[PDB]
Design a protein around this ligand. Structure first.
Ligand code: MG
Ligand code: MG
Ligand code: MG
Ligand code: MG
Ligand code: MG
Ligand code: MG
Ligand code: MG
Ligand code: MG
Ligand code: MG
Ligand code: MG
Ligand code: MG
Ligand code: MG
Ligand code: MG
Ligand code: MG
Ligand code: MG
Ligand code: MG
Ligand code: MG
Ligand code: MG
Ligand code: MG
Ligand code: MG
Ligand code: MG
Ligand code: MG
Ligand code: MG
Ligand code: MG
Ligand code: MG
Ligand code: MG
Ligand code: MG
Ligand code: MG
Ligand code: MG
Ligand code: MG
Ligand code: MG
Ligand code: MG
Ligand code: MG
Ligand code: MG
Ligand code: MG
Ligand code: MG
Ligand code: MG
Ligand code: MG
Ligand code: MG
Ligand code: MG
Ligand code: MG
Ligand code: MG
Ligand code: MG
Ligand code: MG
Ligand code: MG
Ligand code: MG
Ligand code: MG
Ligand code: MG
Ligand code: MG
Ligand code: MG
Ligand code: MG
Ligand code: MG
Ligand code: MG
Ligand code: MG
Ligand code: MG
Ligand code: MG
Ligand code: MG
Ligand code: MG
Ligand code: MG
Ligand code: MG
Ligand code: MG
Ligand code: MG
Ligand code: MG
Lengths: 213, 116, 112, 54, 122
RNA sequence: CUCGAUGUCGGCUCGUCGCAUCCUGGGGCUGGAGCAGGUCCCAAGGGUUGGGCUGUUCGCCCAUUAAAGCGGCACGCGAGCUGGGUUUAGAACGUCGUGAGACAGUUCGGUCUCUAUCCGCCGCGCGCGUCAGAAACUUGAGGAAACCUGUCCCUAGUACGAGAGGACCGGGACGGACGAACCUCUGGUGCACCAGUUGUCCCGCCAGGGGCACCGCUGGAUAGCCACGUUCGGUCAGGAUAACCGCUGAAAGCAUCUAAGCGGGAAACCUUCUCCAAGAUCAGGUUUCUCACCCACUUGGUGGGAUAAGGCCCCCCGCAGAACACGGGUUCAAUAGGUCAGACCUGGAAGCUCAGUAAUGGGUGUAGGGAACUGGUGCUAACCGGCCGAAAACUU
RNA sequence: AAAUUCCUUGUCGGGUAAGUUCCGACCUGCACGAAUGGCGUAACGACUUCUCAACUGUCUCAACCAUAGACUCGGCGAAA
RNA sequence: CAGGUGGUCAGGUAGAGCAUACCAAGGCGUACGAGAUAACUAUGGUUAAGGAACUCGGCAAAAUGCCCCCGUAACUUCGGG
């Protein structure tokens, strides 16, 4: 009974609750969705449900992907992702063509939000893993942000696999756990989710109900 | 306009003001300038904001153009000829056409010009 | 207009007066001392606005007992009962941070 | 650092074969009744006489 | 925010005019002390003939901070000097009265005596 | 082994591993009433602070802490940094030497070179394979990361105890440190933003402006990037074991946790939670689209050509970025620019007029100027286009 | 207890919350001492050493911006 | 070839000045370019709260800075400081 929806992050704002405290929310347009495919265990090996989201022109979608929507009777959407269910009692409440909206979540419930983190480019070691660097004075020649040593000596004559180094950072699937739902606006299709939601302002966001509660 | 992301033209940030002022003096004088392509892309929002002050035509707009251009002969041809010629065109007063790159450094080149 | 204006619209407050930096202002703050819900008055010079609608703040500065205090309230906050403008001000800046280093007669904002 | 040993004929040809010029695409232009070939990024200036075809 | 070596002003009549932070009590390797945090400190300046002398290791609770503090309602409080009050080991001040205003963050940290002696609690 | 060179203490930076365990977790015994302990066994998952002195390692001291563990890795790490000490040349004191000079005796000064070929490692591509050519969603074989803990209240001043003192087990609230994501708030930055102002030159001059002086200096400062800021995380439930505790029960008419058989049992192990992952060559699964021609030869699972589905290149760009890749757009167009209007920053333009001998002040006017954020508008450039790309069979 | 003291961080006082260095003393001077000068000394020192006021990215603890490289394209084109 | 090379002339406006800033007469743009918000290095800039906690050591940076007028200690070789 793990519910889920696809959505678009719209930015952050603040709001005031009944105890006159300030709550930083992050607006997520949990938009209208549709099913388009049901993964049954006897046919596909697991239990899940696809979710299609986003307005798109019907000329921007190629013929292999258009026909996957014609088998379900749905107009083509932009995004398409799966909600992983448990290994039993697959689709007694999901049908093909069913419209899922934002009010499957209640006020005060918890959600787990997964998206793609923002990119930081080819980042050095003080930004990517949080090193310290050598000093800023007292003789330190040209090593103010350099990682220092990366290994031992003749034993072992190798850098170990998994040594933290510089490289790219961001564009990672990041799930943020146990976010409070302040308000679901069924008139606008908008969840007010307390806290931070990973992504640029407009990226794809999967909002699923929490398992840790 | 939109500031230059990354390093500026000609080295410093003060040379780029003088380059975009000299390239705007020469564009409004002749009507067509051959230059490098990253300078033609940078001239196109800068020079169209001076033509917008020409369409308004008041004294406060003339003082605002003289903050950038130092050639009074090209300020006069901007308010008596270039301004009223674009009196019925809502933006988009310039055009970039790409030219063959030049020998010696393979710098990509383009021409920037007024519309008609 | 912004993308998030249909969310802030039910949370805005009408009837908050027009005040600028340099204006001497009483602020009536809701205060909970246990279970009493009293009302405490803060009188001082508004020195700052940092706009944005629901996210707009303002900063008042008073001199309490030889010790300067600043408070940065949000506008449209339900812990402010009502704001009442006392004295209009005639300043030239908009952030007025030079008041953080003057004491006495040298920190007197004009009366226009 | 210096090279410790010289690279053999199979490692100095596998690297050197990857240093090569990329070819450009060419499209068709009929200006003044003479058909030529320019890249597509210069297709506008071919129709305006700004391209010297030598 | 107060870490080690921060010299604070003393806001009572015990005789000390200036203390100097040694630790920030309340956990291993704690870095910053806000309003209401207990400092083990040392007296670096004293009024002559006072109860306390120079070079005495005493405890003290911070009652003013120049750095802002986010209260849970969205508001902030900011002072123009850092101030402390030298205390007994049962959260009562050693002096008999307190100078200057103190913060309301002393109220939820069970420092009830310093509030009732303060000129103005904000 | 190394003298046709294996650069030596300590510190910084980054680690990794053993358990002879400092803390937390599980137990037996006790000269264990309780609270605290002593001692032994099991356990390496995480944590193990900041200062004074000294070149120091070590050590003493200060204030804390749940605790301030011991060790290996060329006493880890100088083609990563330092250079205080030892260990060149100068000089001095003490001592020894008739003297040149000497001293694990002291003191002051004393060049730390290098563009990464190969393995290793951290990232990102190009090619081919995966028995037709493509596109979208995926299972997880197997890996990675994470794993810390305190104070207070209730249970209860109950059990225990002459008293002082003071719980196990269960339940709840709030913190320290640490990590990730984000930019609403606070705060930092701001090199095409706004304003004040000094020297000087220039725009013919006055007015108004600009060039240069670190962005000339100074007060602000939206976006973006940030942390000192905000939000969340290490949870709960299972499986198989350690020490240890058992039940049934002989060989051994008794007894014994054991030889047959069965239980309880922890931060360790394995699932659970987050992430990567079919180059997992056993190269996987469910679906959808094209599902088609022509030529020559030595008639071959042969060579070419031309196409469908489809993608790439070029073009307009991006909060995606070293190149490359990735994401959005290409007139059936709001993709960047312009433009119009908001939001937001600055703080009251120029011109005119009024008041003053003047510097300057009031009015016209929430003015003028202006970048990133939001919506409208078909004005400018997204073109009148090139290059790749689809099948032998056969056996049961 | 020294530019001289091995034992040694001698002992006592001062300064610091904490002082093997520093200052003042004692004398048990391993191994001070009178022109290879003894003990002082105002002024002076890019000298050695210790404390304090002020100020600071030296540090807690790092963030951001511009520029010269690094990087990409075209030309020339080495070295150990 | 970012080094070295004796003498003469030496304008304006601010300034004590042959300093410094901007200019005259007169020279010059000095011989690889074009781009592009990577890490890292280099030369500069700014920084919340704390202010030597850094470190062998306040190394480096920051700070002080000019003219006029009041004011100025121990000690001394009577000049000074
Ligand atoms: Mg970026
Ligand atoms: Mg650092
Ligand atoms: Mg160097
Ligand atoms: Mg350096
Ligand atoms: Mg920028
Ligand atoms: Mg360059
Ligand atoms: Mg400048
Ligand atoms: Mg505002
Ligand atoms: Mg050799
Ligand atoms: Mg025991
Ligand atoms: Mg063991
Ligand atoms: Mg360990
Ligand atoms: Mg585990
Ligand atoms: Mg000290
Ligand atoms: Mg170790
Ligand atoms: Mg070693
Ligand atoms: Mg070691
Ligand atoms: Mg070393
Ligand atoms: Mg080495
Ligand atoms: Mg002799
Ligand atoms: Mg020797
Ligand atoms: Mg030495
Ligand atoms: Mg040197
Ligand atoms: Mg697995
Ligand atoms: Mg992070
Ligand atoms: Mg914002
Ligand atoms: Mg801010
Ligand atoms: Mg400007
Ligand atoms: Mg003038
Ligand atoms: Mg000039
Ligand atoms: Mg900002
Ligand atoms: Mg268990
Ligand atoms: Mg996956
Ligand atoms: Mg493998
Ligand atoms: Mg496959
Ligand atoms: Mg594309
Ligand atoms: Mg606008
Ligand atoms: Mg006015
Ligand atoms: Mg008059
Ligand atoms: Mg001694
Ligand atoms: Mg002495
Ligand atoms: Mg004699
Ligand atoms: Mg003699
Ligand atoms: Mg002598
Ligand atoms: Mg001398
Ligand atoms: Mg090249
Ligand atoms: Mg020369
Ligand atoms: Mg000479
Ligand atoms: Mg002169
Ligand atoms: Mg000069
Ligand atoms: Mg000059
Ligand atoms: Mg030359
Ligand atoms: Mg750069
Ligand atoms: Mg600072
Ligand atoms: Mg400050
Ligand atoms: Mg200070
Ligand atoms: Mg100091
Ligand atoms: Mg350090
Ligand atoms: Mg230290
Ligand atoms: Mg120190
Ligand atoms: Mg110095
Ligand atoms: Mg300086
Ligand atoms: Mg003196």
């Amino acid at each position: 009974a793990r519910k889920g929806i696809l959505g678009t992050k719209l930015g952050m704002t603040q709001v005031f609750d009944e105890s006159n405290r300030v709550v930083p929310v992050t607006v997520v347009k949990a938009g209208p969705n549709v099913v388009t495919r049901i993964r049954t265990p006897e046919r596909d090996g697991y239990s899940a449900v696809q979710l299609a989201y986003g307005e798109i022109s019907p000329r921007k979608v190629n013929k292999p992907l258009t026909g996957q929507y014609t088998a379900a009777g749905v107009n083509p959407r932009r995004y398409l992702a799966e909600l992983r269910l448990d290994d039993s009692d697959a689709a007694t409440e999901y049908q093909v063509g069913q419209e899922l909206t934002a009010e499957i979540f209640a006020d005060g419930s918890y959600v787990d939000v997964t998206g793609t983190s923002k990119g930081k480019g080819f980042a050095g070691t003080m930004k990517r893993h949080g090193f310290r660097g050598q000093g800023a004075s007292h003789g330190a020649q040209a090593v103010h942000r350099r990682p220092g040593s990366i290994g031992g000596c003749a034993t072992p004559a190798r850098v170990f696999k998994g040594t933290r180094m510089a490289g790219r950072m961001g564009n990672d699937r990041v799930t943020v756990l146990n976010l409070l739902v302040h308000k679901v606006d069924a008139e606008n299709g908008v969840l007010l989710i307390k806290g931070a939601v990973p992504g640029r302002t407009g990226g794809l966001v999967m909002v699923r109900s929490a398992i840790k509660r | 306009p939109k500031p230059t992301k990354g390093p500026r033209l000609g080295g410093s940030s003060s040379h780029q003001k003088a380059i975009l002022a000299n390239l705007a003096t020469s564009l409004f004088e002749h009507g067509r300038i051959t230059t490098t392509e990253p300078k033609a892309r940078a001239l196109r929002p800068y020079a169209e904001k001076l033509i917008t002050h020409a369409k308004k035509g008041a004294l406060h707009n003339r003082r605002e153009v003289l903050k950038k251009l130092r050639d009074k002969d090209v300020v006069h041809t901007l308010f008596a000829e270039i301004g009223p010629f674009f009196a019925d065109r809502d933006g988009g007063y310039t055009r970039i056409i790409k030219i063959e790159a030049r020998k010696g450094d393979n710098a990509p080149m383009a021409v920037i010009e007024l519309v008609r | 207009m912004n993308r998030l204006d249909f969310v802030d619209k039910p949370s805005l407050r009408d009837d908050i007066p027009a005040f600028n930096p340099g204006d001497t202002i009483n602020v009536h703050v809701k205060v909970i001392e246990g279970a009493k819900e009293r009302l405490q008055v803060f009188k001082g010079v508004v020195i700052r606005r940092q706009g944005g609608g629901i996210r707009e703040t303002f900063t008042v500065r008073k001199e309490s007992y030889g010790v300067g205090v600043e408070r940065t309230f949000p506008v449209h906050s339900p812990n402010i009962d009502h704001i009442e403008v006392v004295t209009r001000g005639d300043v030239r800046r908009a952030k007025l941070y030079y008041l953080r280093e003057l004491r006495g007669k040298k920190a007197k904002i004009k009366e226009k | 650092a210096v090279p410790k040993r010289r690279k053999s004929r199979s490692n100095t040809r596998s690297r050197r074969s990857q240093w090569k010029a990329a070819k450009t695409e060419l499209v068709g232009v009929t200006v003044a009744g003479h058909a030529h070939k320019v890249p597509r990024r210069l297709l506008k200036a071919a129709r305006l006489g700004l391209i010297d075809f030598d | 925010v107060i870490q080690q070596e921060s010299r604070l002003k003393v806001a009572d009549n015990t005789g000390a005019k200036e203390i100097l932070c040694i630790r920030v009590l309340g956990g291993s390797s704690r870095r910053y002390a806000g309003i209401g945090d207990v400092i083990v400190a040392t007296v670096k300046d004293a009024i002559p003939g006072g109860n306390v002398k120079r070079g005495d290791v005493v405890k003290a609770v911070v009652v003013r901070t120049v750095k802002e503090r986010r209260r849970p309602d969205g508001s902030y409080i900011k002072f123009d000097e850092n101030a402390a009050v030298i205390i007994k080991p049962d959260n009562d001040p050693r002096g008999t009265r307190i100078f200057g205003p103190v913060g309301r963050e002393l109220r939820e940290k069970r420092f009830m005596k310093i509030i009732s002696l303060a000129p103005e609690v904000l």
